[PDB]
Amino acid sequence: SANLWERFCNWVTSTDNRLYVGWFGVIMIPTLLAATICFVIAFIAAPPVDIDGIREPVSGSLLYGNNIITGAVVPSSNAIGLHFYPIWEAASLDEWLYNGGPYQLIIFHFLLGASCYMGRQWELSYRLGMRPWICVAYSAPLASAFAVFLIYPIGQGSFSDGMPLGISGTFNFMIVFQAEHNILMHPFHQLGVAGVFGGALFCAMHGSLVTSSLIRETTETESANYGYKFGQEEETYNIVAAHGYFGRLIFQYASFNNSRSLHFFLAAWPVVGVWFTALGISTMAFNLNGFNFNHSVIDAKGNVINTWADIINRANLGMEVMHERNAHNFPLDLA
Template identity: 45%
Template sequence: MTAILERRESTSLWGRFCNWITSTENRLYIGWFGVLMIPTLLTATSVFIIAFIAAPPVDIDGIREPVSGSLLYGNNIISAPVAAATAVFLIYPIGQGSFSDGVAGVFGGSLFSAMHGIWFTALGISTMAFNLNGFNFNQSVVDSQGRVINTWADIINRANLGMEVMHERNAHNFPLDLAAVEVPSIEG
């Protein structure tokens, strides 16, 4: 009988960690990118969930009216993702065809998706176009005598209408627009 003696490898903790990270014997391959990605994704997910629940209101439009988006401030933002997921999983498959269905099936699915986007974009613009803190086509702040006080929100609203409405030479004159005495008329 022959006995074979093998020397046990005495690797350090760091060496064993390196071997485990780069091993293809794991159920999921982690790799060196995973060493950075997994903690980063966990941190980002945690911060997103905390903000979703408890983020404070922010004066995002610059018109002294804070916009709240978290659940603790009474915003019901759960219904929109639920509606979108419902549409994707239950409604879209009705019009979605595979390549085996030919042009009619694929075109029907893409047409249905495109019309969904067009309808809801138009619905969003039409509901936000009348001074409801969205695409308001009026000036936001006026003084006691009815004169317009230019704000950054007005500049962004006019830019959203298109650069032609601003009657400016280029898009980089926002400070000049703020200092302007006359505001370009938007009404036809």
């Protein structure tokens, strides 16, 4: 009656539905469905996974005697490397599950889906006649997703060095990463931490200031829509105290006295912070490390005077000697 191709093409591109489904959504839905469903089944009942290629597997499943804080989906074995490794690359299913294929399936499907999610955000904003670049803010978590699941494995040369999908898995990754690349002393993670503490601070401040200022808001509302005048009352006086202390410096730092820049600054601060730390983990995949201060101070008799950084380097040795089982004679390593 309207030629099913246009009924399909109307129904998809509709902005009248409960949840938008886009042209990107047509790729987002099966990839996310695969990733989610494989993760639930795997977090419950994935068989133990040989991850080092020594034939000693690491458990990760609730039914095998874990709770959820000790569970994880365990990355693929050290024999796989960067090889593509689908189901039909195994000659039986139980060796596929033993080699940690489920992890690879999940992480590829999720990465695809995340990019489609960003794409769909751009599409609805275009459709409703909005401004774009809410997705540009969303590229900050996508960037870190990329760095920790794709870029850091390629640099190290194996998908067995990626972040496990779990609670204790994530913390194990953090500990063994600090041990070898010394990231606290790397500036890009520092710009990241600054962004996150600053984001929390500016979030708290914005909430408190606005939520005392607003008295009441109102809009007339009808039986399926909203009204004609979005009305609000806000207080509009203040003292020279706050103007001379806080106001003078936000207006000087925006280099504009418009308060339009306030929300702008609000969006920009965590995002940029998180961009730089996403750069950190990427460049550290290519074995460029953070600072190390060793024997900064020695006396004039040739005896080293310790610093507060030497205590940290001792813990780096501590963690690192436990993280090689490979030989006693590991001389110069990675990669």
